[PDB]
Amino acid sequence: AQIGPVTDLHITNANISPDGFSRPAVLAGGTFPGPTIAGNTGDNFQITVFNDLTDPSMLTDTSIHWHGLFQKGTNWADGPAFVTQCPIITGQSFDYNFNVPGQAGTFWYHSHLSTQYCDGLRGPFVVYDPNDPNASLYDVDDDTTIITLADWYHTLAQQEPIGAAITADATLINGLGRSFTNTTASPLSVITVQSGKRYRMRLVSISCDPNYLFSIDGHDMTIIEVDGVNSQQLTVDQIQIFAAQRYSFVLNANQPVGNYWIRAQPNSGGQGFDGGINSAILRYEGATVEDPTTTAPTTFSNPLVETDLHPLADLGVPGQPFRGGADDPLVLNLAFANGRFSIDGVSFVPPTVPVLLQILSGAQNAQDLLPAGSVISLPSNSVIEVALPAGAAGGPHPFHLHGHNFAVVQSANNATPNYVNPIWRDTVSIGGTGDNVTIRFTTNNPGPWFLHCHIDWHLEAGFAIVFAEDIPDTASANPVPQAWSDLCPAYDQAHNISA
Numbered sequence: 001a002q003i004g005p006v007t008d009l010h011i012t013n014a015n016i017s018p019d020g021f022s023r024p025a026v027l028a029g030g031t032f033p034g035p036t037i038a039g040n041t042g043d044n045f046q047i048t049v050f051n052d053l054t055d056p057s058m059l060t061d062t063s064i065h066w067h068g069l070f071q072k073g074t075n076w077a078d079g080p081a082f083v084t085q086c087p088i089i090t091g092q093s094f095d096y097n098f099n100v101p102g103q104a105g106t107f108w109y110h111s112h113l114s115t116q117y118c119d120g121l122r123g124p125f126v127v128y129d130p131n132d133p134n135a136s137l138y139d140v141d142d143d144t145t146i147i148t149l150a151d152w153y154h155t156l157a158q159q160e161p162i163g164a165a166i167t168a169d170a171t172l173i174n175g176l177g178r179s180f181t182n183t184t185a186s187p188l189s190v191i192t193v194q195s196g197k198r199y200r201m202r203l204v205s206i207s208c209d210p211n212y213l214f215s216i217d218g219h220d221m222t223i224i225e226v227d228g229v230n231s232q233q234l235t236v237d238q239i240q241i242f243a244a245q246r247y248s249f250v251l252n253a254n255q256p257v258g259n260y261w262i263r264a265q266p267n268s269g270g271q272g273f274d275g276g277i278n279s280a281i282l283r284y285e286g287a288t289v290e291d292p293t294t295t296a297p298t299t300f301s302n303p304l305v306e307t308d309l310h311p312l313a314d315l316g317v318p319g320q321p322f323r324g325g326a327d328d329p330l331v332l333n334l335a336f337a338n339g340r341f342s343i344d345g346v347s348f349v350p351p352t353v354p355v356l357l358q359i360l361s362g363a364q365n366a367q368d369l370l371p372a373g374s375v376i377s378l379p380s381n382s383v384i385e386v387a388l389p390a391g392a393a394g395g396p397h398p399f400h401l402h403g404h405n406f407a408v409v410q411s412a413n414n415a416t417p418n419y420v421n422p423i424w425r426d427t428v429s430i431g432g433t434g435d436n437v438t439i440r441f442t443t444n445n446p447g448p449w450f451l452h453c454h455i456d457w458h459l460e461a462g463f464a465i466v467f468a469e470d471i472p473d474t475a476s477a478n479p480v481p482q483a484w485s486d487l488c489p490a491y492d493q494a495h496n497i498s499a
C-alpha cells in the first residue's frame with residue numbers, strides 16, 4: 001500500500017538480504033526501498049519521522065529530504081543536514097509539514113545526512129494529478145508501475161574512504177537483484193502486465209552513484225515526464241538515467257504473451273548480465289513462470305538524448321538567448337584533487353550551525369555565513385544562469401539544485417545551447433571534458449538551497465555549495481515551528497557540541 005499524505009514513518013535498523021548477502025541497514029517503513037509516500041497535487045503532506053535508530057555504524061541521527069519538491073515557504077522542512085536543519089536524534093520524532101502547490105510527478109525521499117541514504121533510507125514519493133494532461137495515454141498508474149533502480153553495497157557506508165572510487169556489489173530493481181561477485185540465484189523482481197494494456201511506468205533512480213542503461217527486451221518506451229516536468233511524447237529503446245533522476249514512460253504491453261528481461265547496466269561494477277545480474281523480469285499475465293530467454297540488441301537504435309526532450313507546456317527559457325544573458329550569470333569552477341572536490345576553490349564541509357538558522361539569527365550576507373566561501377547569495381526575482389563545465393574526476397557528475405527545477409540550456413556532449421524549448425528538470429549530467437552544461441531559473445523561492453553532485457560519495461567529499469536565495473526575505477517567507485527550533489539544542493546537547 002502507499003502511505004500519506006499524512007503518515008508516520010519509522011526509521012529503524014534491520015538485517016536485509018536483497019541480493020542474498022545479509023547486512024544491517026537503515027530503513028524507512030521496515031523495507032528496502034521504503035514505502036511509497038503519495039498524494040495529489042497541492043496536498044498538505046505531514047510526514048512525522050520517528051528516528052528509532054540504535055546502530056552507530058550507520059549513524060543514529062537522521063534527516064530526510066523530499067527530492068524535487070520546492071518547499072516554498074517551508075525551507076525548514078527541506079531536510080539537508082546543516083543546511084536547513086540539525087539532524088533528528090534517536091528516540092525523537094519530527095513532523096515534516098509542507099505543501100506541494102503546482103507540482104505533480106515522480107519524486108523520491110532519502111536521508112540527507114552524510115552517506116546514510118546509501119545504507120538504505122530511500123523510497124519513492126509520487127504526487128498524482130487528478131487532471132493529468134497525459135492521463136489518456138495509459139490505462140494503469142499505481143504502486144505496481146513504479147520501478148526503482150538502486151546500487152547496493154556489502155560494506156557499510158561509514159566504512160567507505162572519503163573521495164575514493166567506491167563500487168557497488170549489486171544492482172537492485174524494485175529492491176531485488178544479484179551480486180556481481182559470488183553470484184547466487186536469489187530472487188529477481190517481477191513486473192506484471194496484461195496483454196493489450198498501457199502502463200505509466202514511473203522510473204526512479206535511487207542511486208548513490210552509478211548511472212544505468214535501462215531497457216526492456218522487445219519493448220520501447222514513450223517518455224512523458226522528466227524529473228516532475230511533463231514532456232512531449234518521445235519514444236526510445238534505452239534510457240541512460242543518472243543518480244536521482246526520474247522518467248515516466250508509457251509501456252504498451254503489445255508483444256507476445258511471454259517473459260522479457262528488464263535490464264539496468266551500471267557504469268561501474270558488474271558489466272553484462274551473467275547469472276542474471278543487472279536484471280529483472282517483465283511477465284505477461286498467462287506466461288509460464290520461468291526466466292526470459294530474450295536477447296538485448298548489440299546497439300540500441302533510439303537511445304534517449306537529452307536535447308530531444310521538450311516540455312509539454314510552453315515553458316520557454318528565462319533571460320536572453322546567449323551565454324551570460326541573465327541578471328545573475330555564474331560560472332562554477334568544479335574541481336577534484338587529493339580525495340576532495342571543490343566548487344570555486346572551496347571544498348564543502350557542513351557547518352555547526354545550519355545555514356538557515358544562521359540567517360534567522362541575523363547573518364546579513366553570504367560573507368557572514370558559514371562555511372566561509374561555500375555560500376553564494378542570489379538576488380530575488382532575478383534570472384540566474386549557472387554554467388557547470390565538466391572535467392573533474394569521477395564523472396559524469398549529476399548536479400542537483402534544491403528548491404527549484406531549471407531549464408537545461410546546454411546538455412552533455414553537445415556544444416549547442418537551446419534558448420527556445422529545452423527540457424526543465426532537477427538533476428542533470430554535466431557530461432565530459434570540454435562540455436559546458438548550463439542551467440537557468442528565476443529566484444522566486446527565498447531560502448538556502450543546496451547545489452551538489454548527487455553521487456553521494458562526492459557530496460561527502462565536498463562537491464557542493466549553498467545558494468542563499470533572497471537572504472533579506474528568508475525569515476519572513478519561512479516561519480519556523482517550535483519543533484524545528486528545538487532540533488539544534490537537542491542535537492548539540494546529545495553530541496556535547498558548543499553553539
Ligand SMILES: *[C@@H]1O[C@H](CO)[C@@H](O[C@@H]2O[C@H](CO)[C@@H](O[C@@H]3O[C@H](CO)[C@@H](O)[C@H](O)[C@@H]3O)[C@H](O)[C@H]2NC(C)=O)[C@H](O)[C@H]1NC(C)=O
Pocket residue numbers: 323324331387389434435436438
Ligand atoms: C561556459 O560558458 C561560460 C558562459 O556561460 C563561459 O564563461 C566565460 O568565460 C570566459 C573565460 O573562460 C570569461 O572571459 C574572461 O573574463 C575575465 C574577466 O572576468 C577576463 O579577465 C578574461 O580575459 C576573459 O575575458 C567570461 O566572462 C565568461 N562569460 C561569458 C562569456 O558570458 C565559460 O568559458 C564556458 N566554459 C567552457 C569550458 O566552455
Ligand SMILES: *[C@@H]1O[C@H](CO)[C@@H](O[C@@H]2O[C@H](CO)[C@@H](O[C@@H]3O[C@H](CO)[C@@H](O)[C@H](O)[C@@H]3O)[C@H](O)[C@H]2NC(C)=O)[C@H](O)[C@H]1NC(C)=O
Pocket residue numbers: 305307308414415416417418419
Ligand atoms: C544538439 O543540441 C541542439 C540544441 O538543443 C539540437 O539542435 C536542435 O535540433 C532540433 C532538432 O533537429 C531543431 O529543431 C528542428 O527545427 C525545425 C524547425 O525550425 C523543425 O522543422 C525540425 O523538425 C526540428 O524541430 C532545433 O532548431 C535545434 N536547435 C538549435 C539551437 O540548433 C541538436 O539536435 C543536438 N544535436 C544532436 C546530435 O542531437
Ligand SMILES: [Cu+2]
Pocket residue numbers: 065067110244400454
Ligand atoms: Cu536528492
Ligand SMILES: [Cu+2]
Pocket residue numbers: 065066067068400401402403
Ligand atoms: Cu533535492
Ligand SMILES: [Cu+2]
Pocket residue numbers: 394395396397398453454455458459463
Ligand atoms: Cu560527482
Ligand code: NA
Pocket residue numbers: 316317318319
Ligand atoms: Na524566453
